[PDB]
Amino acid sequence: EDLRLHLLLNTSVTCNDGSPAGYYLKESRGSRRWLLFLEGGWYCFNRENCDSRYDTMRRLMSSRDWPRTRTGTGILSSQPEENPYWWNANMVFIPYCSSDVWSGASSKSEKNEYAFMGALIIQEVVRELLGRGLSGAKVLLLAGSSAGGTGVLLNVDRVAEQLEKLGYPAIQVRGLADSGWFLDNKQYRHTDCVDTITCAPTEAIRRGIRYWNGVVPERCRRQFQEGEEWNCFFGYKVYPTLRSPVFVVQWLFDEAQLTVDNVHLPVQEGLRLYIQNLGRELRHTLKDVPASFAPACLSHEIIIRSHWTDVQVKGTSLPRALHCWDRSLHPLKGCPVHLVDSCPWPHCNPSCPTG
Ligand SMILES: OCc1cn(-c2ccc(Cl)c(C(F)(F)F)c2Cl)nn1
Ligand SMILES: *[C@@H]1O[C@H](CO)[C@@H](O)[C@H](O)[C@H]1NC(C)=O
């Protein structure tokens, strides 16, 4: 459909297996708005777990089998009916093929079976798009879901710094992090981290950064310092260090959070209290995030789904909140930007995704 594949002209910037990374683009000739969306999909943090991902999730590690087009959906749709927010924007979908939460800066070599180049992929996509119209942009919104949402937090200020150093200080860089705001909390039941899905969130990231040669935003790196940069993968810790405006979308009971917490859904008191405390902790971390949308749902659904318009918090949808955010970056009467549910159990918001 609407978005056409371009493999990176710089073939040194590669997916895990050394195949070229790339991006899907649909231009909107009149528009000075650019949406660059980072795909998600977990990660892998050692040879054995990356080898397994290569066998059964190869599109997340290689471009060799990518289709020449993709259909833009949700926030990437060009139909105003599906995307009330930014339907006329230039649309870019950046496939996630680095398995590194978009943090890596390491090539495949004689010492490395895999390349982890997520941070360099973003930089190279931006560089190559400048010749295709991005040089004329007024706003570059770097968005992403799941691992791509965390990728927004890790990379939005680097994109801003890149554009400034390349001589484009007028492009306003902003971030939209969907489902990438995690807690480094205690698991409901202990597991010994061997697989990526149920590994505790803290140890997963500590192993990953070393394997990927992962990079984090400079101000956050200066706070936590050497050996402790894993802290910067956690939204509530990295967000206060960022300078670009960032809108945070996060379900209060995110399914990936529950997975790494070893929760698998009648609920008895201990698990009831665990889940309720998780939602309260998430809500607490968003108290001082002025642009946020945090519904009280158990979900893995993301902003590129076609029915993303349906969820509301306090009667405001996400496309409306994002429009209000745009207005705020020029409070607004009846145009809120901070929308965090206060009810304490999944689906206490009636507009939660049905499943
Ligand atoms: O597609 C699901 C998914 C989730 N994530 C992820 C990204 C960053 C972080 Cl810091 C974490 C966490 F919680 F473990 F720490 C996770 Cl689960 N990546 N992909
Ligand atoms: C290709 O990408 C690498 C890694 O980001 C970079 O060092 C190099 O300068 C790039 N080459 C060109 C011609 O842009």
Q: What is the DSSP letter of 214?
A: B
CA angle 149/83/75 to nearest 5° reads: 15
> Which residues are 174's β-sheet partners?
141
After which residues, if any, is the chain broken (C to N > 2.5 Å)? 265, 330
- Chain centre to alpha carbon of residue 252: 16
Residue 336, token pair as written in the block: 């809120």
Number of H helices, E strands in the chain: 9, 14
Residue 261, token pair as written in the block: 């917490």
Query: Residue holding tokens 């918001």?
Result: 349
| Longest distance between any two alpha carbons in the chain, whole Å | 60
Q: Is 212 in the pocket of ligand 1 (CB under 6 A)?
A: no
CA of 147 relative to ligand 1 center, distance in Å: 6
Residue 116, token pair as written in the block: 């982890």
In a 10 Å sphere around its CB, with 0-12 CB exposed, 13-18 middle and 19+ buried, how is residue 161 labelled?
middle
Query: Residue holding tokens 């790196």?
Result: 221
Contact 292, 300 (CB under 8 A): no
CA of 179 relative to ligand 1 center, distance in Å: 8
- Buried-state track 323-342, b at ≥16 Cβ within 10 A, e below 16: bbbbeeeeeeeeebbbbbbe
Closest CA to 183 of 198, 206, 202, 210: 202
Experimental approach: X-ray
Q: Which ligand is nearest to the CA of 126?
A: 2
Q: Is 85 in the pocket of ligand 1 (CB under 6 A)?
A: no
- Chain centre to alpha carbon of residue 187: 23
- Helix H segments across 9-79? 47-56
Total residue count of the chain as it appears in this document = 355
Q: Is 126 in the pocket of ligand 1 (CB under 6 A)?
A: no
Q: Is 117 in the pocket of ligand 2 (CB under 6 A)?
A: no
- Tell me which residues are annotated as active site: 146, 254, 300
Dihedral angle at the C-alpha atoms of 192, 177, 104, 52, nearest 10 degrees? Answer: 50
Q: Which ligand is nearest to the CA of 123?
A: 2
The CA distances from residue 90 to 33, 67, 148, 173, 304, in Å, are 6, 20, 19, 14, 15
